[PDB]
Amino acid sequence: TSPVIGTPWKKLNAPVSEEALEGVDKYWRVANYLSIGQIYLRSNPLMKEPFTREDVKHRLVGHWGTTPGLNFLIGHINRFIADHGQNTVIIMGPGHGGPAGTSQSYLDGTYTETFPKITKDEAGLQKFFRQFSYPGGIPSHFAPETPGSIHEGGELGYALSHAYGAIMDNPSLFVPAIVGDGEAETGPLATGWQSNKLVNPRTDGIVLPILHLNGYKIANPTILSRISDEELHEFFHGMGYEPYEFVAGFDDEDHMSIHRRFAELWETIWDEICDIKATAQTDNVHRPFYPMLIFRTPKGWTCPKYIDGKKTEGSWRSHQVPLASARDTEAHFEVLKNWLESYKPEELFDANGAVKDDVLAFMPKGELRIGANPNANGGVIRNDLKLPNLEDYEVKEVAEYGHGWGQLEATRTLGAYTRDIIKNNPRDFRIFGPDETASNRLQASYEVTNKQWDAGYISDEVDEHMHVSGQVVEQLSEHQMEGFLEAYLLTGRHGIWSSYESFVHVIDSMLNQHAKWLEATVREIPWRKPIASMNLLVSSHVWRQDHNGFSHQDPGVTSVLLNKCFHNDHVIGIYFATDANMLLAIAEKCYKSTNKINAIIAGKQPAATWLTLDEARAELEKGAAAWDWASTAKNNDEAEVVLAAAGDVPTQEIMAASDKLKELGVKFKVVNVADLLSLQSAKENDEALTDEEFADIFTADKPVLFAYHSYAHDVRGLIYDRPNHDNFNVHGYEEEGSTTTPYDMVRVNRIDRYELTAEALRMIDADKYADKIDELEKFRDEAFQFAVDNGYDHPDYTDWVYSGVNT
Amino acid sequence: TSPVIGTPWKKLNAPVSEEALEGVDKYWRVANYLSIGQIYLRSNPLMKEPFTREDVKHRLVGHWGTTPGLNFLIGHINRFIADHGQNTVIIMGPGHGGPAGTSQSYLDGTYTETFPKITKDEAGLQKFFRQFSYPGGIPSHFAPETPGSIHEGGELGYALSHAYGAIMDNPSLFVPAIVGDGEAETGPLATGWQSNKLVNPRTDGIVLPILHLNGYKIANPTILSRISDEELHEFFHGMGYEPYEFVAGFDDEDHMSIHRRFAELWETIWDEICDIKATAQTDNVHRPFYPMLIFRTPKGWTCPKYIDGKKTEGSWRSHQVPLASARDTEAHFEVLKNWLESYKPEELFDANGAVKDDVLAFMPKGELRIGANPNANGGVIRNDLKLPNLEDYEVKEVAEYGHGWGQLEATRTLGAYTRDIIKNNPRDFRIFGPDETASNRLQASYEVTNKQWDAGYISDEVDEHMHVSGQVVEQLSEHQMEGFLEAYLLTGRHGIWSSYESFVHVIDSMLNQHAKWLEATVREIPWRKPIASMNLLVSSHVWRQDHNGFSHQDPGVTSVLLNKCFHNDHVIGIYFATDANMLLAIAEKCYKSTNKINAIIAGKQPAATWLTLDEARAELEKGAAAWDWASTAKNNDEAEVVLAAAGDVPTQEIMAASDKLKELGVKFKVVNVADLLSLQSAKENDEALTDEEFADIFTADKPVLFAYHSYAHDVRGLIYDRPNHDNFNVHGYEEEGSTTTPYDMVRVNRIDRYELTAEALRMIDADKYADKIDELEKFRDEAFQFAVDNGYDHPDYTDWVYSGVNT
Numbered sequence A, B: 001t002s003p004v005i006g007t008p009w010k011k012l013n014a015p016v017s018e019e020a021l022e023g024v025d026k027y028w029r030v031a032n033y034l035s036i037g038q039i040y041l042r043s044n045p046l047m048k049e050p051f052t053r054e055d056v057k058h059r060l061v062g063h064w065g066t067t068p069g070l071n072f073l074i075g076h077i078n079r080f081i082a083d084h085g086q087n088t089v090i091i092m093g094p095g096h097g098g099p100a101g102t103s104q105s106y107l108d109g110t111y112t113e114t115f116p117k118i119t120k121d122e123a124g125l126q127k128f129f130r131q132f133s134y135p136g137g138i139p140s141h142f143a144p145e146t147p148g149s150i151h152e153g154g155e156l157g158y159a160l161s162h163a164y165g166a167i168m169d170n171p172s173l174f175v176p177a178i179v180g181d182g183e184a185e186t187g188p189l190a191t192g193w194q195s196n197k198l199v200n201p202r203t204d205g206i207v208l209p210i211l212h213l214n215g216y217k218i219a220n221p222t223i224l225s226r227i228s229d230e231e232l233h234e235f236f237h238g239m240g241y242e243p244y245e246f247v248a249g250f251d252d253e254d255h256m257s258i259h260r261r262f263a264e265l266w267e268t269i270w271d272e273i274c275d276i277k278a279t280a281q282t283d284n285v286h287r288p289f290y291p292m293l294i295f296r297t298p299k300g301w302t303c304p305k306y307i308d309g310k311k312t313e314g315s316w317r318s319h320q321v322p323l324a325s326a327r328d329t330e331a332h333f334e335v336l337k338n339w340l341e342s343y344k345p346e347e348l349f350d351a352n353g354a355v356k357d358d359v360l361a362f363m364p365k366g367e368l369r370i371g372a373n374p375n376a377n378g379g380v381i382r383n384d385l386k387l388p389n390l391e392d393y394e395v396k397e398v399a400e401y402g403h404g405w406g407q408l409e410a411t412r413t414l415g416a417y418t419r420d421i422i423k424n425n426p427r428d429f430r431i432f433g434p435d436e437t438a439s440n441r442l443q444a445s446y447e448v449t450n451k452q453w454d455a456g457y458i459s460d461e462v463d464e465h466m467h468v469s470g471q472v473v474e475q476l477s478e479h480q481m482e483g484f485l486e487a488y489l490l491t492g493r494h495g496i497w498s499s500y501e502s503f504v505h506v507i508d509s510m511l512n513q514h515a516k517w518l519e520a521t522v523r524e525i526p527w528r529k530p531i532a533s534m535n536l537l538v539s540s541h542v543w544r545q546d547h548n549g550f551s552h553q554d555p556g557v558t559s560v561l562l563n564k565c566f567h568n569d570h571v572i573g574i575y576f577a578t579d580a581n582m583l584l585a586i587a588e589k590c591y592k593s594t595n596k597i598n599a600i601i602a603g604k605q606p607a608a609t610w611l612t613l614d615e616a617r618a619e620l621e622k623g624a625a626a627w628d629w630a631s632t633a634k635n636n637d638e639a640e641v642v643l644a645a646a647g648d649v650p651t652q653e654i655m656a657a658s659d660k661l662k663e664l665g666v667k668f669k670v671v672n673v674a675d676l677l678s679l680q681s682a683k684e685n686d687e688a689l690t691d692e693e694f695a696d697i698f699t700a701d702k703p704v705l706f707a708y709h710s711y712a713h714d715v716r717g718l719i720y721d722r723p724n725h726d727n728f729n730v731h732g733y734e735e736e737g738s739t740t741t742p743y744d745m746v747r748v749n750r751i752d753r754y755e756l757t758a759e760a761l762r763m764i765d766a767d768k769y770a771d772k773i774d775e776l777e778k779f780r781d782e783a784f785q786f787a788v789d790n791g792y793d794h795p796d797y798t799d800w801v802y803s804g805v806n807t
Ligand SMILES: Cc1ncc(C[n+]2csc(CCOP(=O)(O)OP(=O)(O)O)c2C)c(N)n1
Pocket: A063, A065, A066, A094, A096, A154, A155, A156, A157, A179, A180, A181, A182, A183, A184, A186, A212, A214, A216, A217, A218, A222, A299, A319
């Protein structure tokens, strides 16, 4: 569970001291100086004579525009943290403001504690400026290499989904979430505002949304800066917020007047947030209007108003660098010098290059610091879940009645197990769902918890399994559900979410950014401790989207995840729950895992159980296993064909084909694949089957019929350098299907049992079996015609039960 | 359950027809005519010449002031019921407006269907005017003898508690509840207004409170008529009502315009109530402001404006009769004649004496009639409870280890039993409690239902066992709990309420009124089918109010109920649950019971269990038993003294005395009274023990030591004519006690085991035993001193178990 840090939700009960504001104004000046430093200077950080074009970087990389606004807010938030003792994480939406985030960590001391080479003197300062967005150095964004970051802000949109995920089950946590006014135009951001109806002010922390209304994005004004102020205020009132607006920097008002006005506005906002938290201890079923701050300042604030007779301060022109070169002419270098000199660094550093005591006296200490708070390194908070005994959830009937028994909905088993994990790990585990938790059969969790809902209630006849507090959250937004969970994990908790397989593609780009976050962490951030995995139940999959049709038929997230499977990062898991027992073995491995995205493809549709839990754990350990109890061949040499499957439905059809092939006395080895990456080149993936183990399972020389859940391309790409790879006949999804029957779905994708049988016969001897083949092909048309005439599948398809069952 | 009658919550969707409103004014006129007739005329209803002073009544008995106003309202309600098809019960707050309710029943034709002797002609009018409030006739109030009444309104103040009880689990029922402005000054009424936070507009019906603001009570203006209209409006709004005011009859405005205005306002109020009922099918968690009608009309409306130079219309002087006598002078007869003529009775009756057809054409028919509605005759709705199996609740351990076993809280047993009653009779059974349901140990109910609460919710940390709908209701008003349950039974449902014994006295007057309702019903109202019994758990009793003290120590309710045990009405049960097993037997008896007020005196303290369920049934069947197993005497001749207890605690002390009498070789009978009315004079009660059965149990010649739960005066008055009654030595509560120990409570009322032992010896041989008697007296003064010194009771009192226990 999240730790209670400092003295939360405390009013100052006194005006902000003048000496604190002089601190903030000094922070701002030194942060802006460090920020311009990182962008423009390779050397001479303090402009010791001689200071020349030689000291300026050859390529200017990084963003000024957003930065001075961020520096202003973080200065004021640091003052606020020290005065109040408030557990604070910032979300930097404008992640391209990376200079503001590195400057923060430097100034609060966490940069030097984390990277000892980066000292507090002229030497460290030189290295600090140079290394920014520099080969062999650190990124342009508020990346995971930055202490204080749980949000890089590279792909804009997720500032609010992450803020709200961070405060869930974290009642002492305050999150200023700084939202770009351009970011506000993305879809993900636009729905994120609505998150204030899915958090409770007693059991969760508090998000303060801050609209960085600097008027501009890259090359355009922003919608929200160019609509009437009355429309802007209404918009945020209508999303359940109390909008405050701060305007500064558009006139000659002196900086200390600005700090006084801001510090007083912030404390008035803070006082309302404390009354919300005090009220929540008595009444947490009435949703308050949560403050938010419209922060309207000029983009590029404090840079030169004009450069080359073009407007730069208060323009889109300041977004990257207001001055495109400092090397090209004397005059341009002069501009950089007067700009850097405008902050008066001579008042900010002592002789040996360190920031003066009186610049940092107001700052917070120890774990309250932005860069040192454990919420911003949630692995140090993360505990192992108390897991219940896996054996308690096993489908025992496989052992009694034998392989292929029953018509169980596999995902109900993961539902029972996940229920009891929530029972034993209250406040540490959450399920998210895009209005699909029940549809994906995880509703067993409602036995120990509720859907968290902090909008209106109306009736017990409709409002089932809802409470203002609960470990399940649903909104119809893959972006919200991915976003919430990501931040929950990054702040040291655990969970899972489910989606219909086709609509996983809505958050492909979020999976990408989270993969990339994890790739960077395992590679080069050993201080950033492991977080619980992002566990995604991919269900209501293509083969059984026969009730919804072509729109809902796309297993392609497999292809997308395969694009994050390099360099032995081991940050991606792709699992095919063959059955309920294999789903348990995968759930066990995923729930115990850290630093991964786990895709678990599992049918929710009635299907057979093939494996005992013991057999499934043994198979999962390797990723693929021969099924000796289903093989007719006793060794590889005897085997005329290999029948391999990956997925509940490809396994059903391959297992049905095996039975028809066994009636013709064919010698065939059956193979199951639960771990896609177990098939990956041994050269790329040191956890994959060895080429000797691969050859053992799939044989060295025989024809392999491979029925795959997703697109054949997936497998054909993975096994390019595997032994016997040219003898893989890989059938998968083929962009065929509609509103039809389960049999038609596999038929039309040439993965139905009758086709898989015919293909095996073709691969053994098309001549010897030309007749049986022809008969199979005629049966396929017969079986379709049956569906069209009757409106359900032929009973040969429907009523089949593995020969190996005793009924 | 309560039946769905007519087309409930229907909008009219058109103006009221002129024809309908002509109807209502005729109704008003004829009902004013029938009402003055009942008060003043013994003969010659239609004033056929000669009409003289000899057609008047000698004694003028009945109330006018309220009646014209009631007649106006009832008329307009009948128009409403007929146009809409609305399930409707009225509550006549000013029950002294009896003439209005009888007038109603005659006109709707339920009077002639119930009393075929009272026909629709001059002959029937003559019987009808005579019979009213007249020897060997019918009462002055809206008594139970009147179809449409479930509320006499003799004892003012219960109008709203009855209205709100009536609507509970009755979603089709509409209850216009007419409240006197004088009734409003009473406590029970003043608190009754708040019942709108304890009812739900989906699962319960609607009460429309109508304040009959006629300006006056008997001799005084009413407070609510002489405060500003602004305060009046704010008052009702503050109590969660939408107040509507109708002012009429204080100017020369024509009757037909008054009708037009009123019907408009009525249909506007009805449209609101329909919108409330429609909304509630979707949102029944948000409490609406319920409409209420301030009806401001002159008291005595349509009486002479003056009589003998005294203001009568719009004055307290019309309260009874504005015409003090119609026989004292001729002038006074003229005033009566003129008054009766101003309704133009020749337009209302045909020369036959039938009320014409144009007068009733507008009226409701069938079961929608105020008279015919089954909710006003609840017995016709009353089903038997599906009762669970009494054996399933038995304390089995008395068989195992013998009489006197355990320290169980008896009320917990009653509570598990009643829990299962609710579970099996959903929407048919209710528990009421004045914030004492848990304190009296009846909270097992919370397993299957909740406390009904329709004010605000705030937190799951305080709002336990509470839903907007449930079968348990709690307010800190004994008047509300008693009132709600009364109306719940009258409308043909079942329930129980519990109270601290002392505080049952708050509602003595309501026990009186309901007993009298039941007395009259069983005597001469066979058409009024039998209603479920008013079952009252009387716990937290005098002996174990050692924690609260003197104020909480009053078992008087027994004394009060005995004053309603006559004529073999059998409308009062007074039971003492000896233990949990006696309580189950007493409970089943009460829950199957009808047309009774059952008072069940049972302790909630840890006590011994004396009887199996079979010994309990047996003992309860007759209402007293000899405990063979307890007696040392094997017959009545051998016995030296009879020990008798009524009540758990007297039973304990008597049984402990019995063990000290046993260890001195004394021979004694042990008797237990469970049903107090079994000791009643067999002259007075044909269910009481016969003088033979009595003398058998209590011997005919032996001295009887009687430990009585309550005041000794009770038993001393009940047995005045019983065998061996002068030999009864009755110890009971004697207004001694404080905040003290359990022993000191019995000690200071001379009913402790040591005094009971001493008295048994004093009644055998004051002299032979003067050494044991003196020693017992010295231990009483020595165990009290132990308790003062150590603050718990002497181990001899505390650790005692009956002889006949243990493995
Ligand atoms: C999803 C996405 N689309 C496009 C971009 C490219 N992009 C990066 S910064 C930016 C403008 C952002 O402006 P705003 O949020 O207003 O930031 P600020 O003014 O604070 O720099 C754009 C289009 C992106 N990073 N992410």
